């Protein structure tokens, strides 16, 4: 699939940089024709077949195809796509309140504050999983706040760079996210399904409640070994006044066997979450 090949600068003015990763840089921008503001994500293309620098066209097209499907208050939306020799440029919805990660670092939350974030995350993931989309990279840096200066910030899930359609219940690809947040089936290179996201949600919940990462070791290999062994516990110093029901919720997500793990529907009916 090809994208708009006119110069993006003829239609948009860029401003402040929002952030950058290994292959992407994201800049605030403003569309000239409407005055409306967006986030322009520049993804560097691969320069040759075999290269490791840049993102393969297959991977870029997958991300764009998935983004085109989605319209939900808790997930980032796609406005337009441009490209030139060097980059594909995604014009995305602007979410300007920063990462949930940075929000956590500036402030543990109360259980109310934690569940207020978590419920939005669950709703976004319920939408995605209902469309058979696995995100595969859920973590606090991929949750963006609309406005961080309100008591209950609204959030949107971003970064669909590892996302896949799961049309046969599982996928068997080169898929590996951030060690602190990946499920054991990812660590063990096994077929992956929607269940992997639910594990990541368990890790996020543990962090929201305690300010500590449940599997984090001194090196990435230690973290991955910890994940595979389900080597986590609820430290009393962090969890002494946390409700047992919140611990139960986490415990039913951080389960090695993806078949016994709570699904997104299970998580919405769980007594800690259900109204
Ligand atoms: O740093 C990042 C970032 O800030 C954003 C972003 C911010 C506001 C938005 O409205 C949309 C995206 O996305 C990203 C996507 C990546 O793949 C890598 C990144 O580093 C970021
Ligand atoms: Br700006
Ligand atoms: Br579902
Ligand atoms: Br993070
Ligand atoms: Br994004
Ligand atoms: Br690590
Ligand atoms: Br699910």
- Residue 187 Rama label (left phi>0; alpha psi -120 to 50; beta): alpha
| DSSP E strand stretches across 51-124 | 78-83, 87-93
Cα separation of the two ends of the chain: 44
22-30 long-range contacts (CB < 8 A, ≥24 apart) are 23/54, 23/55, 24/161, 26/92, 28/94, 28/96, 29/91
Domain boundaries, the chain: 7-97, 98-275
What residues flank ion ligand 6 with Cβ within 5 A? 179, 220, 223
Give the strand pairing for 133-134 and 164-165: antiparallel
Residue nearest to atom 1 of ligand 1 (CA): 19
Answer yes or no: is the C-beta of 163 below 6 A from any ligand 1 atom.
Answer: no
Q: What are 245's two structure tokens?
A: 């029901």
Experimental method: X-ray
Q: How far is the CA of 38 from the centre of ligand 2 (A)?
A: 10
* CATH number of the structural domain 98-275: 1.10.510.10
Ligand with an atom nearest the CA of residue 102: 4
Q: Which of 16, 24, 90 to mutate to test the pocket of ligand 1 (most atoms within 8 A of CB)?
A: 24
Look at residue 90 and give its three-state secondary structure: strand
Q: Are 40 and 24 in contact (CB under 8 A)?
A: no
Query: With left for phi above 0 and alpha for psi between -120 and 50, is residue 35 left, alpha or beta?
Result: left
Residue 244 alpha carbon to ligand 4 centre in Å: 25
Query: What is the 96 CA–ligand 2 centroid distance (Å)?
Result: 10
Q: How far is CA 16 from CA 36, 129, 194, 242, in A?
A: 15, 33, 35, 40
- In eight-state DSSP terms, residue 171 is B
Resolution, expressed in angstroms to one decimal: 1.5
Identify the CATH homologous superfamily for domain 7-97.
Phosphorylase Kinase; domain 1 (3.30.200.20)
Q: Is the dihedral of CA 42, 11, 80, 96 positive or negative?
A: positive
Contacts (Cβ under 8 Å, ≥6 apart) of 188: 228
């Amino acid at each position: 699939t090809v994208f708009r090949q006119e110069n993006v600068d003829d239609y948009y003015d860029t401003g402040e940089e929002l952030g950058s990763g290994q292959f992407a840089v994201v800049k605030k921008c403003r569309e000239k024709s409407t005055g409306l503001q967006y986030a322009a994500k520049f993804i560097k293309k691969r320069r040759t077949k075999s290269s490791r620098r840049g993102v393969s066209r297959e991977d870029i097209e997958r991300e764009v195809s998935i983004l085109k499907e989605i319209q939900h208050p808790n997930v980032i939306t796609l406005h337009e796509v441009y490209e030139n020799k060097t980059d594909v440029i995604l014009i995305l919805e602007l979410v300007a309140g920063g990462e949930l990660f940075d929000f956590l670092a500036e402030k543990s939350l109360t259980e109310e504050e934690a569940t207020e974030f978590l419920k939005q995350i669950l709703n976004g993931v319920y939408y995605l999983h209902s469309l058979q989309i696995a995100h595969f990279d859920l973590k606090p840096e991929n949750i963006m706040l609309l406005d961080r200066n309100v008591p209950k910030p609204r959030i949107k899930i971003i970064d669909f760079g590892l996302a896949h359609k799961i049309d046969f219940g599982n996928e068997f690809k080169n898929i590996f996210g951030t060690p602190e947040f990946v499920a054991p089936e990812i660590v063990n290179y096994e077929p992956l399904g929607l269940e992997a996201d639910m594990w990541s949600i368990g890790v996020i919940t543990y962090i929201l409640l305690s300010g500590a990462s449940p599997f984090l070791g001194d090196t990435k290999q230690e973290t991955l070994a910890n994940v595979s062994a389900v080597n986590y516990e609820f430290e009393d110093e962090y969890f002494s006044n946390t409700s047992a029901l919140a611990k139960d919720f986490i415990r039913r997500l951080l389960v090695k066997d993806p078949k016994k793990r709570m699904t997104i529907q299970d998580s919405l009916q769980h007594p800690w979450i259900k109204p």
